[PDB]
Design a binder for this molecule. Structure first.
Ligand SMILES: [Mg+2]
Lengths: 157, 145, 109, 121, 242
RNA sequence: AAACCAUAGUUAUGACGAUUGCUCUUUCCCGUGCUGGAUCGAGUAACCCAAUGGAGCUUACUAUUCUUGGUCCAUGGAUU
RNA sequence: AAUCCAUGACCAAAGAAUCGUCACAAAUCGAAGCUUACAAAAUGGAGUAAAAUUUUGUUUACUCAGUAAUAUGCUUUGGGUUGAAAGUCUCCCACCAAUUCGUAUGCGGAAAACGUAAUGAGAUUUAAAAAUAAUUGUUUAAAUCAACUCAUUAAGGAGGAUGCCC
């Protein structure tokens, strides 16, 4: 619990507290990888923890996909994000939503990205430090095929 | 019963001895300023003669005679400053100490000789050299960003 | 019995039970004791145990290649199994005078 | 209630198994790095393009760690995919002092989320 | 991991103010040490036993690693420690160690006379014993004092840098290091590089071969150097903290 | 275009430190004696070294340059 | 002639073991290994705490798998390895109810220019070794013993005779 580093820059974060890291991910890492100003996208952000209900999260997700206006010609994108051990529950909620949504003869188009936080801890000896890496998975799911977002650094799924 | 050979890998590193010019502190910057290049006046018979002179001056007569029986430079090119010298397994430590005690070239000053890998086969030496060359490119690619 | 640290077993090996006075030393050795350099530390003095601690014999002792350690196939007594409150057990060879530490697991065969 | 879990069906032809590491929950980090480097070197002589890294359940976290390690350390393209894995579980149904191992069996399917991680050269 | 414990600071007295060129040369030589491959660096600062110690605690160390080398520390990724040697000649102008032991981390000594060795082996809270390898040793290294100062924990420091200065002092350095090896009986031997220029620093292989040909076995060199340097760093840090 | 595979694997098996055991000689002790114990020492050799795996045969080895068991209508000394 | 002691000659067996150490998110004089992906937390997990909501439902802040994994580390062994790795020696390493050594031949053996057992004889005057396939510095013997070569003895069950304990 010595320090948190992202993009070779030191940040004031805490791995044990989920709220601060989730707000940091919502506010910093996403705008530097996707720009919602020069496009026609409506982005709905959502962070997933391990203490959240799966059914309630799916009830949030199937609503967040049909909240924006359809007359404006909006492509509605949902940005689900998590970090650490909560990524397992994040994937479970994503797959359950996919199973519940594809049943109606539709298709879900997904783009994935994997980055990492770098933290430092005390090693075995007092004169040695260990560097741990915490994964960060960001998924963008939408019903339309074409998105004008800069998603060349993602992976098509 | 069997002639046991042992090759030594050594490298020429030039320290940035310049107090009037401030330097950048990082990994790849100092790697590049230490691996700049070798001068033009660099050869195999010019390094062998220098190391023989140094060995005869530091160890002595018998100390140079016992090591100069199988003291040869097998492979060396001035483009990267990596050479492979052949020697016996009995006098290998003496050759390493002579490489350490190398003061300077007859015309070129301010250089360090660093022994990196020593083994009794050339295949593993080449493998370790390839691994080191591959590792060198990583910090370079990372710092070019 | 699987060896959890440095050691190599063989067939016809002796199985000793960890004593009660030297119970924290083996636990610390199983947790970790490193040198100031950073690597592990096995160069210490061994607390040789007593003689009345024979509880089993290893019949099939060979270096396990599936996990990377030394697997020992022995047969321990049930009374001594219920005696100890821990699963730690010492292994010794027939000619070697060193005692390795490990943990045994019951096989339903 | 007593219930055991068998592994999941793996259908590998001849080479999909070779260039693929299945990360267990007890698999160390450095051993995974070593085997991944060996696979990365042996792929183009096996004749493939990427190295598959498959993990499910508890090992997903360190699988993503292995992925993001080679992502920036060696600067190699990575691809992450989210898949579903069906596992068969053998349970005892109620319907003489008999061992619980030798009892009536019933198969049940269970779906779990998993991550496939491909690494380019 | 490797440890160097004898990097000299270009300053002898306290009135001596540092020069930017000296700091640049020290940066160059530390970068060269990190280039050849090292993990722990402990810069040394020399002072005379006859000089007046300051009536300060916030000014005992004219180094302040945090403000000068603190940027190199988190950029290149090494560590720096404080070490001070004591050039002691006779029992006068002294009797103060409790205030110099709290500021610095490692305390060394440099005896050059008969009574200097006795006073170093009697009541000096020191860790390393350093001799003038360049010039002649004071009288004769005997077992009666060396054994007694090694059995308590004080090791003997060998400077392989002084050899690479000129050609004439090489003979004296060899004749002194072999006497130290013969007297210490090869137990408490720690080595350091007392070079101020980046042209007089070597690697582990060359130094190991040199000390092996000079009279120390290959087990002693490695084990002593590594573990004893780590242990002296550890006990220095512990006595600095508590 | 691979079939690449060794509880050594392609001529690599390095550097020293410490402990136990064996041979003879040096001495002590209980109860002649004991795979007896303890110092003062030396020696741990020679033949020779793998290149895919196994078996058989023959040929080199052990003199203060380690050892062990038995045999001899071989000689040398002593008793009946 | 019996026993003991010392030397010499000849035959046969074996090749003492144990512990610790050696920089570089990789290394070493080298080598192998730590991959049948899950903690029944996916039948859309189990609960606690606050607001509002006429209970549901929804928004925040937490607990539970704890025998928990612990970041180039960690464990093992490495020249006689079946006592000779040495040697221009021999043979196996695909089958063939059969032009394919269809060979029940002293015994064992898949084969072996392979081990051993009982008897008789032999020495360039001999079946063959020397003074007109492999190996070995000497390279079997030539009073007796010991060693080499060649020539005979097919497996199992039943009856009679002889010798031993009885
Ligand atoms: Mg051969």
């Amino acid at each position: 619990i010595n320090g948190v580093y992202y993009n070779e820059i030191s940040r004031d974060l805490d791995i044990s507290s989920s709220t601060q890291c989730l707000r940091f991910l919502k506010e910093t890492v996403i705008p530097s990888l996707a720009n919602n100003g020069n496009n026609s996208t409506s982005i709905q952000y959502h962070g997933i923890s391990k203490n959240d209900n799966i059914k309630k999260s799916v009830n949030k997700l199937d609503k967040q996909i049909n909240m924006a206006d359809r007359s404006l010609g909006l492509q509605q994108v949902v940005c689900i994000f998590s970090y650490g051990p909560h990524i397992q529950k994040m994937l479970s909620i994503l797959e359950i939503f996919k199973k519940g949504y594809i049943k109606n003869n539709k298709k879900i188009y997904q783009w994935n990205k994997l980055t990492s936080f770098d933290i430092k801890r005390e090693g075995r000896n007092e004169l040695q430090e260990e560097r741990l890496k915490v994964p960060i998975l960001v998924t963008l799911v939408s019903d339309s095929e074409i998105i004008d977002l800069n998603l060349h650094s993602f992976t098509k799924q | 019963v069997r002639l046991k050979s042992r090759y030594i890998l050594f490298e020429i590193i030039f320290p940035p001895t310049d107090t009037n010019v401030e330097e950048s502190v990082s990994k790849a910057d100092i790697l590049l300023s230490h691996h700049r290049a070798s001068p033009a006046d660099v050869s195999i018979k010019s390094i062998l003669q220098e190391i023989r002179r140094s060995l005869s001056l530091n160890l002595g007569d018998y100390g140079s005679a016992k090591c100069n029986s199988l003291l040869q430079l097998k492979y060396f090119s001035n483009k990267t400053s990596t050479g492979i010298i052949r020697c016996h397994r009995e006098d290998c430590d003496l050759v390493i100490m002579a490489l350490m005690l190398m003061s300077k070239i007859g015309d070129v000053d301010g250089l360090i000789v660093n022994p990196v890998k020593v083994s009794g086969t050339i295949k593993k030496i080449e493998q370790f050299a390839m691994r080191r060359n591959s590792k060198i490119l990583n910090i370079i690619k990372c710092s070019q960003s | 019995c699987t060896l959890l640290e440095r050691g190599h077993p063989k067939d016809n090996a002796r199985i000793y039970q960890v004593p009660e006075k030297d119970l924290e030393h083996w636990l610390q050795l199983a947790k970790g004791v490193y040198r100031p350099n950073g690597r592990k530390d096995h160069d210490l003095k061994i607390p040789l145990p007593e003689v009345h601690d024979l509880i089993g014999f290893i019949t099939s002792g060979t270096y396990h290649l599936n996990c990377g350690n030394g697997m020992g196939i022995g047969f321990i007594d049930h009374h001594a199994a219920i005696r100890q409150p821990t699963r730690y057990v010492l292994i010794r060879n027939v000619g070697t005078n060193t005692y390795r530490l490990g943990e045994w697991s019951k096989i339903s065969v | 209630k007593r219930v055991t879990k068998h592994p999941s069906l793996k259908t590998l032809t001849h080479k999909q198994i070779h260039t693929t590491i299945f990360v267990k929950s007890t698999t160390p980090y450095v051993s995974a790095l070593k085997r991944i480097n060996k696979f990365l070197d042996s792929v183009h002589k096996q004749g493939s393009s990427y190295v598959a890294v498959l993990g499910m359940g508890k090992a997903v976290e360190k699988t993503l760690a292995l992925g993001c390690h080679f992502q920036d350390q060696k600067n190699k393209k990575i691809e992450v995919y989210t898949k579903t894995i069906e596992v068969l579980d053998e349970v005892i149904t109620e319907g003489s002092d008999v061992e619980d191992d030798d009892k009536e069996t019933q198969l049940k399917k269970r779906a779990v989320s998993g991550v496939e991680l491909r690494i380019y050269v | 991991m490797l440890v160097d414990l004898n990097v000299p600071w270009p300053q002898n007295s306290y009135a001596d103010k540092v020069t930017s060129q000296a700091v640049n040369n020290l940066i160059k030589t530390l970068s060269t040490l990190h280039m050849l491959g090292y993990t722990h660096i402990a810069i040394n600062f020399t002072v005379n036993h006859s000089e007046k110690f300051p009536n300060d605690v916030k000014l005992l160390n004219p180094i302040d690693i945090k403000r000068r080398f603190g940027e190199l520390m988190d950029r290149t990724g090494l560590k720096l420690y404080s070490r001070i040697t004591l050039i002691i000649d006779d029992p006068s102008k002294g009797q103060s160690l409790s205030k110099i032991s709290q500021a610095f981390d490692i305390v060394a000594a440099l005896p050059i006379s008969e009574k200097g060795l006795t006073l170093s082996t009697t009541n000096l809270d020191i860790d390393l014993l350093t001799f003038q390898y360049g010039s002649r040793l004071p009288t004769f290294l005997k077992h009666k004092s060396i054994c007694s100062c090694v059995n308590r924990g004080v090791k003997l420091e060998i400077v392989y840098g002084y050899a690479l200065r000129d050609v004439q002092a090489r003979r004296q350095f060899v004749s002194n290091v072999r006497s130290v090896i013969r007297s210490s009986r090869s137990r408490g031997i720690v080595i350091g590089s007392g070079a101020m220029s980046p042209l007089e620093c070597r690697n582990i292989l060359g130094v190991t071969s040199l000390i092996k040909n000079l009279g120390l076995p290959s087990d002693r060199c490695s084990k002593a150097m590594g573990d004893l340097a780590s242990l002296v760093l550890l006990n220095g840090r512990l006595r600095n903290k508590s």
